[PDB]
Point group: T
Chain length 143, copies 12
């Protein structure tokens, strides 16, 4: 079901919104400004992904998650409880979650195609493109 | 303690970010576009308030909340589980939470002054100004 | 006399500037933001009309009104003392005053033509165009 | 045939351009400005869709329709002869035609795929995305 | 009657909107980009003229044409059925229709003046200015 | 009472809006363009101050003045009846009224603090900052 | 004849373009920057007036002047041979030429009306509006 | 293999970057500015295509070509050694290479689909859309 | 003498300003819009060159020419009396005058260097760069 | 005395303007561009702080420092004579001076309050907010 | 030596930055706004000149001055201790220092040429151009 | 010969365009975004230098290189075959090639001067200025 994948991805998106803010506030190192700036852009992307997933759910005639409580229940992303990081820790963690999201959007694309949902396929493949680009660049940071 | 008020307000800000998205997605009525547009601007304001509160906490040498789990634990805002609203329901609910926030920022302003924290006073009073304006306009919607 | 029509219109323009602010501040209803926004644009137009009429008077070698006292003496617009309105009340009142202004600018156009004042004719006809458009749209609100 | 679907959609697009202008000019109610503004954006979208469909037809080596006469002959949209509407009438009518267009673009996407026309598939699916979003929002107006 | 001239001009404007799109899509020659660009600007002008004429009709308290069917019935412009043109053919055809429009707006200006309609005179004379400029430039293309 | 100071300041703001227009239209001297430009910016500031004071009054749950009649009754600013000025006359007069406003906003700040109105204090102090800067610059003109 | 007035005005416009450059380069006094800036804007206006008059002549089917030689022959403006001025000299001279132009555009408006040339009337009256405004402001400089 | 098609296309993109610069510098005819401008936009598109292909290769975990030497070895585009062209020569040559690229991106789309590479399919189909549009317009130049 | 070359170039610049307007107004052919647009940019460049030369003369402590009469006396450019041109005629004529200007700026550069005038050398060489580029492009039009 | 604190802060601001330029020019390391960019923004802030402090002094009716000589005499900041730094050295030094400034603005805020100077309190607290934010971020660089 | 001239000019640039701020803050007269605005632009130019000279020194492999102490030691500009000026005093003083700078940049240009330093010649000549223009305009203020 | 230096520099510019793309795609390290961004700006500069050199060659009446084959034959830059770099490797390599280019533009400047080619001297010296600045900043990265 396309709806089931979408709803779990919506949960992930708000959890990541929060996680990346953590990295944003609590990064240490001569690298601060770069990472602080980059994490800001990343959490804005998750805020947008969060809105988009929810509105696609609505367009499909279902209910998006509407509480942080549901988000916590439905997410596959582990919340980060540490409050201090250097650039390499942050980029490693975001990479791991991106790889998770990438597999989820591959499934989204495949599932929506089976169900003949052309619009969700287009959305999934577009997110896939953004994720695969970011994945490379993050891997490049860590090499 | 200024830190204690800030941390609960940070929790409220992310809970409201979520609540207002609910209103944003699930508003019904000939009024749709106005409310959809207005709720978008409101949740962006809460996203900004969320970031600002957290960074003020950091500047004070403490840890902001970094998980949705903490946010749920610390918030004074009840999460909205309904998935359908007309303009009047939405404006009533936001008004109620604004009045809650307004009292919290009054306390923030007073507490930070007692502790000689001029910067947090300035921040609290500025939020107070924005809230008192919005409160009027929301009351005007419902009259 | 072209000057006499201009001077009374200048008085009307500042009185309407004030009247529309009243509507702007004191509108009630789910309609608030639309009307609040629209009345803002309307009073800016009257501020501009006020300046333009006065400077045309100066160009004609006469004195514009320079006090609120003169404005009160010279206006044909009744000042609104109520402090609470819904969208329909506001649009009705503005419509009534627009119809008054429209007849005044028709006379302005005709009088200035008789006196061979081509520039005031052009100005009058341009205001006429703006007024006749707004009149339609206001009538449409009330139908 | 991809060409046959495209040519009928081109006819629909110009008919809708006209229909939405009708709604644009002849809307009544306190809602006027919202609907007047929204219908303007909608007819611009149909003007763009009209141009795009015609140029895709040309790229396919065929002739687009070039007269209003052909448009009338080829359209599946009934022309609206009423000259007065409230917001709910307008949103109902546009919704009905959007649902028609949505089914047409689904067929377009499917047909072009059978014929191996990747570019028309991409175009169809993109229009599908825009339509499905608008359909939700229009349904939301009427609930 | 001012209304009668306006209604036929409204019909012409939408017919020309269509005709110029034809030229836009189906121009041939090393000249392509210039003509393609220029015809785009021209059809946007006719779209604007179409809207303006219709709204002036509404302001006069009458009904504008609201269907392509009426437009076909009321137009004085012959629809172009050819699907291939070089720059000189296109500029010749547009010139011919501009000369037709120019005579219509001269009548519009004269008729509205007789009926004391200052606003329509201003509108007619402004269109006249745009047309007479374009007429020269088109004649210059063909010399 | 904070309300009482605000209401008299609202009256002053519209009276000054008018007075500065007088200076704007009726300035003489090689200095014309500078003063004409500067007085334009000044009256826009008073228009803004007028709106802000009135909306703060509304936020406090009271009625702002809504007529020029009330404004005349409540103002402490004497209206200027002269219709001719040089730069030095104008700058002297504006300086005198600024000094009056400055004392009023000092009282506003002090009174609102006594009543625990943090938002009005912030507003008063901000206006105070703008006024004290302008006062210096005006004094500099006259030295 | 409308053509005859236009051709002499075209000559005046290029002569004034040159004259105002003189003022622009050769102004003296603490006033330098204001006058230097203002004369720049004025000569740009004459460059535009020059182009517009010439293209209106072309639209009328006649030849505009195409040489400085013709301009010298046809102008009613005396060329300024002095190479040093203070602000008051400059504003006096421009005022004198504006008054000349103003009478010429009055004649233009009247003559074109007699000949039924609506477009030239509109152009003349628009220039008249700009000139009468500038005339006031220049008179204000010298008072 | 998707990688093999991408690498040859990367080579083509830099070769075309160079070829189009040739046309850009060495175009002759009254047509100069149009072609000079158009070829500039075209080579910027190839520079972008070059970067995109290379970064997609990197995202796939392979090495893009990194030398002009490899580009020369791998390209299917013949380099243009002439140093003088008219508009028709240039548009013919670019058309021929576009048709080559179009077939390559069709294969890219098909191959990536077989290998389940959704992101490269999306990229290929998007380039296909741009190419098919440009192909039409170039054919139109030559007709 | 640097002054002598500058003064004759100032005369040329205003003569060319006029000549290029001629081409601008009186160009014929399917080429109209390109040439009309290009000649507009060219005469703006001569207006700028005219101002710059004159102000450099002033900076050198001498008097620039201040009348069209002096310009006619001092110019080396023959005024164009024809009132009809095709693109090739226009580009030929501008080319011829550019070649004249180019030799003049070479002399300017050389003369100012002999006299140790570094600023005029820089100005001359910069104009030389612009001219040599334009000369190529014009030659390209005619090949 | 508020004046005494302001005057020493004015001295500090110009000394820091100079010190940060040193860091700006003479930073070494792979970090160069980040630090070079960041130090540019920092010295612009000190230039602004310098101007603001001086103009506040003027508004208070006193004389600001007007020479580098006074600045040297009055500053509490030690001038940096080294001409080579890595990012960590630079951020350490700026941090130390920020902490000094922060204590000075705390005193400024407190002193101005005692003297009833509301405007200087507002200015001090605003600078305090900017400083406390920058202090955190600099500390984060060094952790 | 090019370095020696550059280092003294760097000292002058920061001294002038300070001197012009003095004029900026402490100008008196109806002229205030013009001079206040103009001196702001002038000190920004000296801030830029200061940065540029220092970075050119660095590019030459030497150390720029890095303290106000060195600046005071190395400058040829006398610091202004007065705290009150009218427009004419200010423009006289800036003129005198500009003439000093102009001679310094002439030497810079000549010296760098002898040493074969083409880049410093270009920089010197460019500053020379800006200075010679400003010198004229300042002389014009005082005539 | 100026032409010979230009043609080899044109070859270098396209080779460097390619080399810097290599660095752009294949940079590794926490530094990724900075270097990726900086190398993008650098290759755009080489693309611009490539175009400029070629068009200067054309202006001189000769043929620029028009194939990658010629570029390979004529370049003095060794192509980089590695596909992995850290920031320090990249900045070292670009520095080395900049130093090569710098010596080439010194020769260009000297040679063009001998041949009396003022325009190429200006171009060479301008590139020299950009290169000497970049050389410093790159050296600073590596210190």
């Amino acid at each position: 079901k396309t709806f089931e994948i979408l709803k779990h991805l919506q949960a992930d998106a708000i959890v990541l919104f929060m996680k990346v803010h953590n990295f944003h506030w609590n990064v240490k190192g001569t690298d601060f400004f770069n990472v602080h700036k980059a994490t800001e852009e990343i959490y804005e992307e998750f805020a947008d992904m969060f809105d988009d997933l929810a509105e696609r759910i609505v367009q499909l005639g279902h209910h998006p998650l509407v509480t942080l409580s549901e988000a916590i229940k439905l997410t596959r992303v582990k919340e980060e409880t540490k409050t201090s990081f250097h650039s390499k820790d942050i980029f490693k963690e975001i990479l791991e979650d991106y790889k998770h999201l990438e597999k989820e959007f591959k499934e989204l694309s495949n599932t929506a195609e089976k169900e003949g949902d052309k619009v969700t396929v287009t959305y999934a493949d577009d997110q896939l493109a953004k994720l695969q680009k970011s994945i490379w660049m993050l891997q490049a940071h860590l090499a």
